């Protein structure tokens, strides 16, 4: 079934428009580039806190450092300023500076990096950028974009929005981060579509990757808003 109940092949434009080159050259051309399974070429959309944010066709299984150095002149403030990177896209969790170095953007390597290839829409936050604030617009963006049919997504992201609003402000207790963990996994795999799961991965990745920083901001709220 599909549109008006008809068979309909939904293919991403990048996969559609690369299909020429694999029919004009063959599978050897596509498979030679990129790692096992993850092969070919994809538009890596370097942006965020990068010196020269642009969209470049790029090989996958590419180290992050030369991804931003060669094609963009580096990350603003260097790697030390770089606190984390969202390499794949929104549905791909961010990973810390101690992990980025030269992780390869091949689907398997993001999986071991607890993230995904997404659409290679890689964006960077510097140290000056608060990671709690960095995804603050991201998580509320997911809430602003949800059809709301299934209960986990309709009641999830908005509830996640409010509980994190007091998180970035710091009006919460240390247990509240654990509750945010619990309901994030609760909506995971329980929504009709992948928007909820797509919204789950960003917040899910942040919790298990910069948890002490999340616990850092809250007593900062407590000392002055006592």
């Amino acid at each position: 079934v599909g549109v008006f109940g008809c068979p309909t092949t939904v293919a991403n434009v990048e996969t559609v428009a690369v299909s020429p080159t694999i029919c004009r050259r063959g599978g050897a051309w596509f498979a030679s580039f990129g790692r096992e399974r993850n092969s070919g070429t994809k538009l890596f959309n370097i942006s965020g806190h990068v010196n020269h944010p642009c969209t470049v066709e790029e090989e996958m299984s590419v180290p992050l450092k030369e991804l931003i150095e060669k094609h963009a002149g580096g990350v603003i403030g260097g790697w030390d300023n770089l606190l984390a990177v969202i390499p794949g896209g929104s549905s791909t969790p961010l990973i810390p500076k101690s992990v980025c170095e030269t992780v390869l953007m091949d689907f398997d390597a993001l999986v071991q990096a607890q993230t995904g290839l997404g659409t290679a829409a890689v964006i960077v936050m510097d140290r000056s950028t608060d990671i709690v604030k960095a995804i603050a617009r991201l998580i509320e963006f997911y809430k602003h974009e949800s059809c709301g049919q299934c209960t986990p997504c309709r009641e999830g992201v908005d509830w996640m929005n409010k509980v994190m609003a007091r998180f970035v402000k710091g009006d919460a207790r240390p247990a509240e981060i654990d509750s945010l963990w619990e309901i994030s996994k609760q909506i995971e795999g329980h929504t009709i579509c992948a928007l909820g799961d797509g919204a789950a991965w960003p917040v899910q990745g942040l919790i298990r990757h910069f948890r002490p920083e999340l616990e850092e901001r809250m007593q900062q709220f407590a000392l002055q808003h006592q």
Partner: protein, 55 residues
């Protein structure tokens, strides 16, 4: 309490026991009838994480 010494040594002797040590009625030994506000405790399930009622 009220009762003078003369009545006292009569009631101690007739009973043979020191009744003035503790009385069968209270003059001033009770809690003040109104009490300062309390603060009730919490229990094993007033948590937000791994308290799923199923287990």
């Amino acid at each position: 309490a009220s009762a003078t010494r003369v009545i006292q040594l009569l009631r101690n002797w007739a009973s043979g026991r020191d009744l003035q040590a503790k009385l069968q009625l209270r003059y001033q030994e009770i809690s003040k009838r109104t009490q300062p506000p309390p603060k009730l405790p919490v229990g094993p399930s007033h948590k937000l994480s791994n308290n799923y009622y199923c287990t």
